[PDB]
Amino acid sequence: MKLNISYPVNGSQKTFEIDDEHRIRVFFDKRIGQEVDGEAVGDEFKGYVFKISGGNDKQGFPMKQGVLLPTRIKLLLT
Amino acid sequence: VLKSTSANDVSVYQVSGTNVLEYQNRVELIQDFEFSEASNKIKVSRDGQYCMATGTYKPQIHVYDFANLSLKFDRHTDAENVDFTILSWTKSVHLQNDRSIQFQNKGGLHYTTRIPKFGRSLVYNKVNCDLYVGASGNELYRLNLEKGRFLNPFKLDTEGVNHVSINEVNGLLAAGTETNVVEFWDPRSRSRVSKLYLENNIDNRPFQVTTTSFRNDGLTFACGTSNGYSYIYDLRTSEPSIIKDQGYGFDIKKIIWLDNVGTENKIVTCDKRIAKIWDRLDGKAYASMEPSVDINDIEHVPGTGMFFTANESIPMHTYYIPSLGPSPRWCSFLDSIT
Amino acid sequence: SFIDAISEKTVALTAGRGRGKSAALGISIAAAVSHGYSNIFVTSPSPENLKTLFEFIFKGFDALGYQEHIVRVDIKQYIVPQDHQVLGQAELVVIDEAAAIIVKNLLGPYLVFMASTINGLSLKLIQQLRNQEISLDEPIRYAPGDPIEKWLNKLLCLDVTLIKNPRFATRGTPHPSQCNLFVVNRDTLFSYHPVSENFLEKMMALYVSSHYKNSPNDLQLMSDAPAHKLFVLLPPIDPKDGGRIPDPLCVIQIAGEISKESVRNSLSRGQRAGGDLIPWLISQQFQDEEFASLSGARIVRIATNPEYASMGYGSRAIELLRDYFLLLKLSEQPPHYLHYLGVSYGLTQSLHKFWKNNSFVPVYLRQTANDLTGEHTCVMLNVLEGRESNWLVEFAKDFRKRFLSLLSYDFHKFTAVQALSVIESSKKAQDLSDDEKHDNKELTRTHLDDIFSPFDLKRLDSYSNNLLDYHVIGDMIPMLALLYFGDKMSSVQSAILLAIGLQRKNIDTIAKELNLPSNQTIAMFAKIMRKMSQYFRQLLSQSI
Amino acid sequence: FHKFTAVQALSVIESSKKAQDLSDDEKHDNKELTRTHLDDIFSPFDLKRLDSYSNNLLDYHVIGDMIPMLALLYFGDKMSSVQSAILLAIGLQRKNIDTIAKELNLPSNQTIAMFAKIMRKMSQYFRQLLSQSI
Amino acid sequence: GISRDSRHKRSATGAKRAQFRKKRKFELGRQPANTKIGAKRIHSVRTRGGNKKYRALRIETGNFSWASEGISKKTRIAGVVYHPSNNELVRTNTLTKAAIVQIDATPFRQWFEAHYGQTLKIESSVESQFSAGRLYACISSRPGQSGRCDGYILEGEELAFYLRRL
Amino acid sequence: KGRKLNYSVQDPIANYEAPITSGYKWSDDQIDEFFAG
């Protein structure tokens, strides 16, 4: 997976291509807004907390905050 | 984690309430669940999706796909509705406040027919296919979907009927009249079998029975009133009953069983403001579902512990009980958020 | 004709339903040789014995005119008979049969093999007539028949006959509203006559409807017992001069054994009386082993009437409560002649509806068995209750012992039922919670016992896997003992409780999720239960 | 109990490797105390120990050899010795399989005699626990 | 609604073979919004330029007029007992123009006690409602078009004019 | 009474649904011995 990370008050943002998906599996089945630890995604970034803010999947499709159903669905938007 | 109202040692949740950081942690389940300031009647189809919610101003049909979590369409029907049923999937029959009957299809509006007097309720018969429609007066009509005829309408008492239902495993036609008599007809014989009378101990004014129901054992019958008093009935000593006064008691409109999920012998009663749920053979309240606005009616989704109301506000409330059962396969992360 | 139809269609559904003789296992098993020669190669029955000798004509025809030479057949065309489970779980076949058989397993095999199910008047006939089809029940291979067998079947009731009809307004169910059934205690009730023995044969038909298999002592050794009584429903009627029996249940009694059970255990017959065998050898009881036994043999209800089918268990419990309150249909003789001391119990054969009947019975069940039987899925767990309530300590001790045995019996059967496990825990809770009060207090958060059972690393691991993102495999080392400890010593509704019982029975999360809800839903319920358990243990470690 | 039903000799080898690591690394730090009296009284039942004595002087059937066998195997793998047949019996009660499966797969000889040896080891453990606590 | 045209129906001569036309925009029949009692919700629909039309459905605060002095004051709604433009309309208890609906007349009590002093020249069968509280009053305004519930009280002649009816 | 109760036959509903043979899972004899009284 790739992880986009943003430190907002300093104004910094960078992506990190993290393979080895048992590091990734901390985020699994956690919807948007619920926080996370650095401890189970990495070891070299411990004491870290990330509020997730969506993400495009493969096939590029975005997620909007808080509906349900982590597959794709066909809604009515602007 | 959605907040829970206080109850008798049990938890319920609402999704799409009048109150429902919150913008960025939104818990919206079904997108575009809001009507034009009220709601008529909501019911969920026999299969695992496709719930239908009737409209309020410029009344619509509003079929929601459960496996898409949003709206499919809204056929703005010609008149304001009171009662309808669903006949599997795409077909459905409706009747409006005027004495007219619409047949919606996949294309929508397959026919518009009428009944001679103003109607109040409709049910469909799975066996030999005649919809029975209860109306004002001496008249309980049929529209058979076999050959499209009319049938020899059932001769009632003076004022009429508020609700008609047929029993499922054996077919015993109920008709909740005004003069406390329940007027059981036989869907085989096209004749009466019984004229059971309803009694109480308070007797405020001459109440009228407004809700009738059965279940899939075919032996009991749930009865209502225009006063907020549930009743049970059996053939076993059919003259008395067990009764349930409700703490506000205006008019109970929806009494439905829990005869297909676990935590058995339980039944939901629903009058204009509150909807409660209690147990059989004692008559003690399991839980209740107090919203912030009145209730036009309710419904309960099969297989799981969730409820869908039609109310007088802009959205509709859904009520999840994590002790009656789980959340269904299309809502299978409601048990992960709350 | 069925041989030609099943050779030309593999489609073909035949059921050979015997009554007492002459067609159970032979002719419909011999009706497979044309298929086994011309159209099939994957034949696969599933009998215990005497099926090839039943189809000896098919076997001889194949050995002399269809194959150039027991075991599975060949060509130089296999016939692999198996068990019922292997027949249900492995049949890509063309022909399959299992005579004298335990029918959901055979329904599980109906994929490509020709349907030929046969047995020698049970719920298999109901399941065969309620599916969506030929029925073999015919005369014997003889001209008139056998008058010796006719006399023996007149004396032994080998055949049943439904006789109930709606011959009055008070015939069907106008009486079946407040019918309080009576007793029948005629000790020579089967004396040879037309009318009384005709009514006795009708009561035998209503007793052997929805009963067990076609036994040899159905109406020939239980007919001449010491005090083999019965009841008869439809009491409230005075429009006519007759009577029928819609609830022909069988009870029995035997020694009361305060010296006799100890003398039998000395005489190496400690499993003497059915009451004081499992209770006497369970925990070496004293008072329930000193009492005698009054148990049941075969319950009966309405396989005909709806209202009497609803009220049959209530009438059975009312007959028990009336017991614990020539041909004369009387209930006033046992008003003084219905006496006992502590002999009031039974044993219900392990079905889910039968355990529901035992819960409505509320006389509670101790323990079924350890394993299964060749004629029973599980042994009858002993039910018990009395009206003259004095055995509160005996009942509570037996309930706590049986509940500890069941909640510890992890791999007792190893393919058990979660619904039956919920019913067993419910009967255990009801028995221990209604005698007077449970005089055995639960584990009230002894923090030394908490720090003794789980250590610091197990505590922090459970707390981390609840309050963070971890794995079920990352915290399923404690998933066995914590389930039994929570069940013995919070709240869990019947989904979360069934999940906790499944984890205590060590079934996989996917293995129970593929059955009940889903993987994600089951994992969320397990996460909520682990959050609740970590909350209670955190309250214990915060209070102490 | 859940998802390790592999072997008996390899299971004994793994337990011996873990205890060998503990003995090589520790001097007296992770030295566990023995089964305490009232805690051992709470872990079994008194009627369960009565059924254990019934297995000692009688048959060892499942009415007293299945409810207590979990605590038996737990205390046996906790902490005063076991044989090869008795070690396979302790591992067999830990794996919770029935009688004719594990011993007949591993030793493949003297099934009922090894079951009686397992019952005798159970009687020795029950006599040791009874004469220690009670 | 559907229509407003004579093309779908027969005239005073009895003609046939209609099959006329696709119906235009200016035959616009909107749905009959049967106004009820609830919480005050008025739909603001558009027509003919910026001609907003107030379609009231759940109006409460009826401005009902004391007749003999013409005092239009604010009150609530209870229910219509008689309206044979549809005899099922009173069974369903809606609120349309020219209906006779019941009012808790407590602000009329306040105005009488405020501009006359004492409490109770006015008719007796409305003095009974002066005592009890619920007086009969007929709606004048159109909630389906103007969105409002105005009305006039029943005082004597018009009272008996309806009480002899039902 | 013009549009009131036209006892005619209508075109799209003449085969809108289709019946069922067994129908009720009970028997008619179960109906008779269900509500004899």
Curated annotation (Swiss-Prot), chain A:
It is found in: Cytoplasm; Nucleus, Nucleolus. It comes from Saccharomyces cerevisiae (strain ATCC 204508 / S288c) (Baker's yeast). Belongs to the eukaryotic ribosomal protein eS6 family. Component of the small ribosomal subunit (SSU). Mature yeast ribosomes consist of a small (40S) and a large (60S) subunit. The 40S small subunit contains 1 molecule of ribosomal RNA (18S rRNA) and 33 different proteins (encoded by 57 genes). The large 60S subunit contains 3 rRNA molecules (25S, 5.8S and 5S rRNA) and 46 different proteins (encoded by 81 genes). Interacts with snoRNA U3. uS11 interacts with MPP10. Component of the ribosomal small subunit (SSU) processome composed of at least 40 protein subunits and snoRNA U3. Present with 66000 molecules/cell in log phase SD medium. There are 2 genes for eS6 in yeast. This is Small ribosomal subunit protein eS6A.
UniProtKB/Swiss-Prot annotation, chain C:
Its main location: nucleus. Residues 232-325 form the N-acetyltransferase domain. Disulfide bonds: none annotated. RNA cytidine acetyltransferase with specificity toward both 18S rRNA and tRNAs. Catalyzes the formation of N(4)-acetylcytidine (ac4C) at positions 1280 and 1773 in 18S rRNA. Required for early nucleolar cleavages of precursor rRNA at sites A0, A1 and A2 during 18S rRNA synthesis. Catalyzes the formation of ac4C at position 12 in serine and leucine tRNAs. Requires the tRNA-binding adapter protein TAN1 for full tRNA acetyltransferase activity but not for 18S rRNA acetylation. Its EC number is 2.3.1.-. It is an enzyme of class 2 (transferase). Belongs to the RNA cytidine acetyltransferase family. NAT10 subfamily. This is RNA cytidine acetyltransferase. The lineage of its organism: Eukaryota, Fungi, Dikarya, Ascomycota, Saccharomycotina. Interacts with TAN1. Associates with 90S pre-ribosomal particles. GO terms for biological process: maturation of SSU-rRNA; mRNA modification; ribosomal small subunit biogenesis; rRNA acetylation involved in maturation of SSU-rRNA; tRNA acetylation; tRNA wobble cytosine modification. Disruption phenotype: Leads to a strong inhibition of 18S rRNA synthesis. Deletion results in an altered alkali-soluble beta-glucan phenotype. Heterozygous mutants show haploinsufficiency in K1 killer toxin resistance. Acetyl-CoA binds at I302, A303, T304, A309, S310, M311, G312, Y313, G314, S315, N357. One of its GO terms (molecular function) is tRNA binding. ATP binds at G18, R19, G20, K21, S22, A23, A24, L25, G26, I27, R141. The gene is KRE33.
From Swiss-Prot, chain E:
Component of the small ribosomal subunit (SSU). Mature yeast ribosomes consist of a small (40S) and a large (60S) subunit. The 40S small subunit contains 1 molecule of ribosomal RNA (18S rRNA) and 33 different proteins (encoded by 57 genes). The large 60S subunit contains 3 rRNA molecules (25S, 5.8S and 5S rRNA) and 46 different proteins (encoded by 81 genes). It is found in: Cytoplasm. Its main location: cytoplasm. It comes from Saccharomyces cerevisiae (strain ATCC 204508 / S288c). It comes from the Eukaryota. Component of the ribosome, a large ribonucleoprotein complex responsible for the synthesis of proteins in the cell. The small ribosomal subunit (SSU) binds messenger RNAs (mRNAs) and translates the encoded message by selecting cognate aminoacyl-transfer RNA (tRNA) molecules. The large subunit (LSU) contains the ribosomal catalytic site termed the peptidyl transferase center (PTC), which catalyzes the formation of peptide bonds, thereby polymerizing the amino acids delivered by tRNAs into a polypeptide chain. One of its GO terms (molecular function) is structural constituent of ribosome. The lineage of its organism: Eukaryota, Fungi, Dikarya, Ascomycota, Saccharomycotina. One of its GO terms (cellular component) is cytosolic small ribosomal subunit. Present with 15900 molecules/cell in log phase SD medium. The modification Phosphoserine is found at S65, S68, S72, S85, S124, S125, S128, S131. Keywords: Cytoplasm, Phosphoprotein, Ribonucleoprotein, Ribosomal protein. The modification Phosphothreonine is found at T61, T106.
Curated annotation (Swiss-Prot), chain F:
Induction: Up-regulated during cold stress and following nutrient replenishment by dilution of cells fron exhausted to fresh minimal medium. It comes from the Eukaryota. It is found in: Nucleus, Nucleolus. Involved in endoplasmic reticulum to Golgi transport. Involved in a protein-transport step blocked by brefeldin A, which disrupts the Golgi apparatus and its incoming protein flux. May also be involved for mass growth or cell proliferation. Belongs to the AATF family. Present with 15400 molecules/cell in log phase SD medium. This is Protein BFR2. It comes from Saccharomyces cerevisiae (strain ATCC 204508 / S288c) (Baker's yeast). The lineage of its organism: Eukaryota, Fungi, Dikarya, Ascomycota, Saccharomycotina. The chain holds residues 460 to 496 of 534 of the full protein.
